[PDB]
Amino acid sequence: XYRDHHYRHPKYC
Amino acid sequence: XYRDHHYRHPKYC
Amino acid sequence: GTLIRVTPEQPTHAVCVLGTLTQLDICSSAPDDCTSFSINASPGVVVDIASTWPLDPGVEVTLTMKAASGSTGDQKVQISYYPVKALLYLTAVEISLCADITRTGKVRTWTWGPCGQGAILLVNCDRDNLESSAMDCEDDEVLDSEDLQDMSLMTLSTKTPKDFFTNHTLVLHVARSEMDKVRVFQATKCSVVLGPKWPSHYLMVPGGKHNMDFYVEALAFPDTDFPGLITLTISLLDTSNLELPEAVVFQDSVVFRVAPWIMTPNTQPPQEVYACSIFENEDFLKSVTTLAMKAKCKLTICPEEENMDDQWMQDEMEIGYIQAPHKTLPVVFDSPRNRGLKEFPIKRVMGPDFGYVTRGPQTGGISGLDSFGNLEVSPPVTVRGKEYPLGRILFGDSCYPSNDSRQMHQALQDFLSAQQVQAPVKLYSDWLSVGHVDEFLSFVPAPDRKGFRLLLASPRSCYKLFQEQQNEGHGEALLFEGIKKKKQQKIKNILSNKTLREHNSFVERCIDWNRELLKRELGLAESDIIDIPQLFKLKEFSKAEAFFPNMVNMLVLGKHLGIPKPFGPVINGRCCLEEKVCSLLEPLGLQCTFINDFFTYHIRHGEVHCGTNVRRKPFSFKWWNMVP
Amino acid sequence: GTLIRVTPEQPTHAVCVLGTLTQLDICSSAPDDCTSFSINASPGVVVDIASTWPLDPGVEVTLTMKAASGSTGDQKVQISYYPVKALLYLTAVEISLCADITRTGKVRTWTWGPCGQGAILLVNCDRDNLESSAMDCEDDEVLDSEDLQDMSLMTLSTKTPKDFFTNHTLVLHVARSEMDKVRVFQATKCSVVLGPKWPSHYLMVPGGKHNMDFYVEALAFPDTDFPGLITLTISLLDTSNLELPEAVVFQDSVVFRVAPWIMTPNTQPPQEVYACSIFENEDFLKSVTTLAMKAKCKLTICPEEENMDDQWMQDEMEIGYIQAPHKTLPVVFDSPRNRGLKEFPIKRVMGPDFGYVTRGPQTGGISGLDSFGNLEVSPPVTVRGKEYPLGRILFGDSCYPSNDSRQMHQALQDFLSAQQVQAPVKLYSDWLSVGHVDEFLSFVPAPDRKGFRLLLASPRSCYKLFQEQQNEGHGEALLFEGIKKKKQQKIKNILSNKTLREHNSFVERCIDWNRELLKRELGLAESDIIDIPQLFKLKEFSKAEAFFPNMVNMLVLGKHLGIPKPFGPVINGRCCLEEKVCSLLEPLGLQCTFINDFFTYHIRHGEVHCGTNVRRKPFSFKWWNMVP
Ligand SMILES: [Ca+2]
Ligand SMILES: [Ca+2]
Ligand SMILES: [Ca+2]
Ligand SMILES: [Ca+2]
Ligand SMILES: [Ca+2]
Ligand SMILES: [Ca+2]
Ligand SMILES: [Ca+2]
Ligand SMILES: [Ca+2]
Ligand SMILES: [Ca+2]
Ligand SMILES: [Ca+2]
């Protein structure tokens, strides 16, 4: 992900 | 069209 | 190009592939106080410096080897810094991915011309299996041995030390964009490795010397969404550490081009003639059989039980070919029109060594200009220096788009344009009631000048002929006297017809525009064109129709011509139109035979050529030698 | 090329257009007994024979005129056959369809290079009207005068006798394939004549001298289904007889090419810098404002009420330009990613003289490699003779396709490939957790050699620097000591980390493969590359992430660099990494400024460049002078 750079991620998003 | 050369025609087909 | 960095704190092990240049970087981790270096190489390693040398980034070191090692780390290189010592252990392998890049018949870019490189792929569009009704490329298995003759061979040769692939892996892959237009079978039997489903495969190679064979086939012809180039890549990856992901160490590629679909003009020798057997089509079939026997070619007659009362063989399909340094085979292009003969090109044409292709909306809306009697091709021509050794494609269109205008379907147009070997040419043929370029132009062979003659319909010539006939005291001759159950017309009443004269003048204007187009687009002269007498008449929608059987709509088989019988006026026991055509064509060495098609084809607005299809010998010129 | 046939039985009236060659056929209807001919021409007509001449098809007659007639049938030509006489009445008109074929600024093929011909069309993608939210090309009307500055001018000049168009007509048309990507307005005010609905128009021209003005605009950028060429045709048709259909007598055409979308590298001067104002983003914004003020450029800050808590300005859009001999204007390319900033490029970027373009699935499924932080462009380069005066496009991909691999969307790939002026290059960037080529490569200006320097991340360099620091008695320095609320790491414990060493070795292998790709694809040498110290660590899915703020992910504004602050070990009162970067970059004339982005961007896996976007000056080189 929402505020993270990753478009999708099991952990950060 | 039926037996005519024209693919479509108001008269021959 | 590979970079290897050597550090004096620990030796490094690197893998080099024969035939690839390896640059050795020594200043990346050289001692700060060092100023010069020396190289000590094993006799199996050749070093090139581009006896100490200055330690600067400008100087370069390149490594080469001549033999693949039999053990890992066989060859060592010593770098002496001024003295600290650094070591480089190194093993050599040979990885080759070979195709027929020379286009000669025997096994990373594609270039046209006789001095180019690149392999050619054939679409597996035929039906080599006799227990199926679909094409060979619709399944991911090879069921016949002969099916391997339509597939390109690619050889992977590996010379690696024993127990080399316990730490390295080989992957064969293709891009996701081209993965749906290619299929690769590994020869062991033939098992699929790459295709429209799997874009990558993990090859299993044993150590030592190994050769693997792959058979490549294509699933799609070049189109507007497919340039025609397919790249198959082999990647050597390091897999030394289990936790760490595999890292790419080597990559090689092979580029194939899909062979385009090529037409054949009337100047090519004939091989097979197709015809239909509808009711009362007996004398026409007898004449066609006699002409084919004289021309030394076979006949294929479709029974009425399969015609569905359709006699227009020419419009339904068009026969061309596809060739490659290993295999050539004809292909049938199915017209979007589906009237009666919609099943013939798929059930009685396509078979062993005979491919099939189709385009356009099968059940959608189309026009009468989509029939393949509107599609023709010219002999090879030189236009202002540019060469066309296979000819140019010609099809009909209108002058400008409007509400009532017709056109060939855009799908067919982009297909023909994607087949680049013959650049299509648009001609004005919408003025005709049917709209077929075969109704006013034709090509015949001739043993002089460029090697061919272009025959064009000319109302002027017919009017001049009738004028001379009337001047010579023959003005009461009856046109249509040979045929019965019709109105016979005298010469004077056909000369004093103002409406017919105006209609013929308009038709002549259209044909003159077409001739001016053709001369510019084919580089012809006034000596390359012959005007055949003809007469047209405007009809419903103010569109032209032939007044008497179209004599230019004839069948050409080498030097034998089957011409529709015009049934013109008879002077001195001979038809004047037939005599004029004989005088015009016979000096070229051709033999004119006149076929009666009045009550069978002409009544239905068709002629001898409209009801026949001919298969012609492929060009001797290799398409990959053309430079579009 | 036009053919005129003369018959002695009746004179013919023909219309000739100035500038076109007219061939006069005399043997088509010549008397049979005739053997020689003579020509008597009016002084206003020039005849060329290619004083009698033999009457054979080999000889040709060509007619030319120097002035448009003021009356129909003004000039007569007499053909004397040997003596029968034939007459030809003839009138001359001038029909010109002029565009900016010289690409100079002032008013039938398109060729690249400085010695070519062809006009350039601009897509009307901006919003010159302040009372609408859509682009200018979405309607068939012109509402502003300034809107006429983005349209190409085409002039139709007619010099015809009085009462000439009572029997002739002029039609302006375009093909049905290109009719949906063009629109033409006739200037009177501006009324549409040709467009995606009407493919033909019947022009109304008065007799005498007349000039008409047309404004042409494009509605689509070049793509995989659009080569980029549009042909507009003018046809002169004869309409003498009402019952007979109109016959085409003359045809002229003008070819336009749609200007492609062009990127700008980091070596171009900056003009405007974009940034986002999220919570706690204050010191970063202050540093950005100071850097922009020093670089003499403006700032555009998006308020948090429009950010929707999205701070990644770089990924959402990419700014390029489109230029033509009359007008140049920037364009914004909208990424298929739509996260928070999905409305900024359409509501606060596109406006007067600022176009908009987008591709990809707006609501479909995409990957993290579609963000425009993965799309960059290189400075102009010469590769083995081939010239790229605008640079080459670089974007990231994987080594080979597989189940877990990612890629940039095919729609974007074919769009960038269709923009031919910069050939895209695929780089291996899927090994990163985010997968953005901006995380390991950058370009900076330099006043020597090729004019630029390529900076690449290098774990080796950082490890060497730490080794020298430990050798010089500094082995207890604490990395991450400048920042708080985090674990500070000594140099010895970061040097004795085997897992970190293996991860960095794998990352170095990937970066070395990328460097070997870049050297071959851009024609670089070892002196054109500078290695920036860096440290990576493998993470979830075994993908690399920056250990400390990515120093190569910086903002470049001319000679001013905003670098993320690494917060490295402090030796002698200065950070060793900062000192090394300054020593590496300052000799090139650049000035290094370090920006703190630890708790705002680095924690969220981003850096200074990831959260900023810069608009750069267009290239001085004209794209139409490039030869792809
Ligand atoms: Ca098969
Ligand atoms: Ca087969
Ligand atoms: Ca069919
Ligand atoms: Ca076969
Ligand atoms: Ca045909
Ligand atoms: Ca508008
Ligand atoms: Ca505008
Ligand atoms: Ca967006
Ligand atoms: Ca504007
Ligand atoms: Ca970018």
Author numbering:
A (entry chain C), B (entry chain D): 0 to 12
C (entry chain B), D (entry chain A): 4 to 53, 66 to 97, 103 to 127, 137 to 217, 224 to 663
Pull verbatim passages from the article behind this deposition.
PADIs require calcium for catalysis, and the sequential binding of calcium ions results in a large structural rearrangement that forms the active site cleft. We report PADI4_3, a cell-active inhibitor specific for the active conformation of PADI4; PADI4_7, an inert binder, which we functionalise for the isolation and study of cellular PADI4; and PADI4_11, a cell-active PADI4 activator.
The lead inhibitory peptide, PADI4_3, binds the active form of PADI4 and inhibits activity both in vitro and in cells, with higher potency and isozyme selectivity than previous compounds. We determined the structure of PADI4_3-bound PADI4 by cryoEM to an overall resolution of 3.1 Å. Unusually for peptides derived from RaPID selections, PADI4_3 itself does not adopt any secondary structure elements and relatively few intramolecular hydrogen bonds are observed within PADI4_348. The structure confirmed that PADI4_3 is a substrate-competitive inhibitor that binds within the active site of PADI4. Although PADI4_3 occupies the substrate binding site, rather than directly mimicking substrate binding by directing an arginine towards the active site, a histidine residue, H4, occupies this position. 760 Å2 of surface area is buried (per monomer) and, in line with its nanomolar binding affinity, there are many specific intermolecular interactions between PADI4 and PADI4_3 across this interface. This includes a bifurcated hydrogen bond between PADI4 R374 and the carbonyls of the PADI4_3 D3 backbone and the N-terminal acetyl group. Hydrogen bonds between the side chains of PADI4_3 R2 and PADI4 D344, PADI4_3 D3 and PADI4 H640, PADI4_3 H4 and PADI4 D350, and PADI4_3 H5 and PADI4 S468 are also observed. In line with the selectivity observed in COLDER assays, many of these residues are not conserved in other PADI isozymes or mouse PADI4. This is most pronounced for H640, which is not conserved in PADI1, PADI2 or mPADI4, and D344, which is not conserved in any of the other human PADIs.
